[PDB]
Structure formats: structure tokens, C-alpha cells
Chains A and B, each alone.
With several copies, the nearest count.
Chain A
Amino acid sequence: FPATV
């Protein structure tokens, strides 16, 4: 999964 903040 891609990075989110």
C-alpha cells in the first residue's frame, strides 16, 4: 500500500 499521513 502507498504511504499516507
Chain B
Amino acid sequence: GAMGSMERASLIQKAKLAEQAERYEDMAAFMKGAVEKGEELSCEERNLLSVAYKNVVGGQRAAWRVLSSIEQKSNEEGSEEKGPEVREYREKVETELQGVCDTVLGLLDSHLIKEAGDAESRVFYLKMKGDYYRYLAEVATGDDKKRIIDSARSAYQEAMDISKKEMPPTNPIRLGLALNFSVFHYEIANSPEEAISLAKTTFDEAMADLHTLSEDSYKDSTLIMQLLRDNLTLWT
């Protein structure tokens, strides 16, 4: 594409610079270019891809929520008519958000997931697939919402099955996947009991395996465990 003439290594180098400068749209474009070179991504490179898109879509989501709240208020009794502008602008932001999600899902489908054989890479990519279908689900209102939800669920479930068979219960990828799938259950699938059960079981099984870890691994795992606990506290 636009990055077709730049070396893969230069793309990675500039993604790292963009991260330092908090230029996440540029970071995402550089990492998209790197993926489109066709080679598999290292662990570090996967992390750069995920950070860039997480920050781009995270800003979009926050803006969409602001605009949706204004639009909801505009449709309450006693609200004065202000015309089509709030809906139009929410729609603009939504369409941009959907386009970013479609871009990431496209990279995963062409061809990151099919070439990912090791458990750690495959689980990482399937978690991303679940996440970006989840973001699509957050804004979905039509005859495809059910199918979008099912696409998220299916990706997360495949990732969960792999992680349980192939990774220890303290593995950060495994833990982060569970955290996010539990949020899926609570916020998207209208399954708060499933969300709570998953968070609890994940936390407890990780706790029992902490004794096997180095100091630095212990720090990583306990940080994510605290996020599970924070959600449990919010929900109970």
C-alpha cells in the first residue's frame, strides 16, 4: 500500500518512534505496512501492532460514547429539536470506528491467524479478533448485531480452548484473554453470572500457580490478576 516502498525494519523502527511521540495513528499505519510485508510477527512486533490499534480505537470509542450520550438526551421528552447534526456526527465517528475495526480484522484474516501455529501467537491474534468484533458489537443496532456478537464469542472461545490446553494459568496472554472475555459476557452478551464465574475461576487458578514464578513473572501476572479483582469488585 502506501508503505509498500519502505523496508520492514524501517517500519518497525518508526512504529517505535511513533509510540514514544504518542502518534498512535502513525504507529498503526506503520504496523499495518509491516504486516502487509507478509512475514510473521515476533512477540515484540505483535505487541506494537496491538498497542497502536488499541489506542486509535480507544479514542474513537470514547468519542462515540460522548456523542451517543448527547444524542440520547436529544430524544428525551421536553428536549428541543436541534436537527440532524448530532446523529450525523455520531454516524461519522461510528463509521470511522467501524473502518478501523474492519482494517484490523482484515489483517488478522489476511493472513496473521492462518500462519500462527504457536499457541502464544495464535491465542494473541484470536483475542484481538474477539476484541475488535466486541468493539463492532458496542455500536451495532441492526439485523447483524447477533452475528457480530457470535463472531466475537467464537473467536474468544477458540482462544480460550487453546490457552487452557497449552499455557499455564498465570500466563499474561491467558489472563488478559480471560479478563476481556469476561467483560464480553457482562457488557455485550447480557451474561453477568458467566462474567463473574469466569473472572473468579481465572483469578483462583492463577493464584495457585504463582509459586512457580520468578520475581518478574510474578509481577506481571499479579498486575493482571488485580484487574480481574477490580472487575469482580465492580460487579459484586
A interface with B by C-beta (< 8 Å)? 2-5
CA distance A3 to B176 in the complex (A): 10
CA distance A4 to B227 in the complex (A): 8
- A5 near B224 with CB under 8 A, answer yes
Closest CB in chain A relative to B120 CB, distance in Å: 15
- Can you list 21 pairs linking A and B with CB atoms under 8 Å apart? A2-B183, A2-B186, A2-B187, A2-B230, A2-B231, A2-B234, A2-B235, A3-B179, A3-B183, A3-B227, A3-B230, A3-B231, A4-B131, A4-B179, A4-B180, A4-B183, A5-B176, A5-B179, A5-B180, A5-B224, A5-B227
CA distance A1 to B72 in the complex (A): 18
* Residues from chain B with Cβ under 8 Å of A5 in the complex: 176, 179-180, 224, 227
A-B contacts counted at CB < 8 A amount to: 21
B interface with A by C-beta (< 8 Å)? 131, 176, 179-180, 183, 186-187, 224, 227, 230-231, 234-235
10 shortest A-B CB distances, which residue pairs? A5-B176, A3-B227, A2-B231, A4-B180, A2-B183, A4-B183, A3-B230, A3-B231, A5-B179, A2-B234
Closest CB in chain B relative to A4 CB, distance in Å: 5
* Residues from chain B with Cβ under 8 Å of A2 in the complex: 183, 186-187, 230-231, 234-235
Q: Dominant SS at the B interface?
A: helix
Look across to chain A and name the residue whose beta carbon is closest to the beta carbon of B227.
A3
* Residues from chain B with Cβ under 8 Å of A4 in the complex: 131, 179-180, 183
* Residues from chain A with Cβ under 8 Å of B231 in the complex: 2-3
Look across to chain A and name the residue whose beta carbon is closest to the beta carbon of B199.
A2
Closest CB in chain B relative to A3 CB, distance in Å: 4
Closest CB in chain B relative to A5 CB, distance in Å: 4
CA distance A2 to B183 in the complex (A): 7
Closest CB in chain A relative to B136 CB, distance in Å: 15
CA distance A3 to B199 in the complex (A): 12
* Residues from chain A with Cβ under 8 Å of B186 in the complex: 2
* Residues from chain A with Cβ under 8 Å of B179 in the complex: 3-5
CA distance A3 to B183 in the complex (A): 8
Closest CB in chain B relative to A1 CB, distance in Å: 8
* Residues from chain B with Cβ under 8 Å of A3 in the complex: 179, 183, 227, 230-231
CA distance A3 to B231 in the complex (A): 7
CA distance A4 to B180 in the complex (A): 5
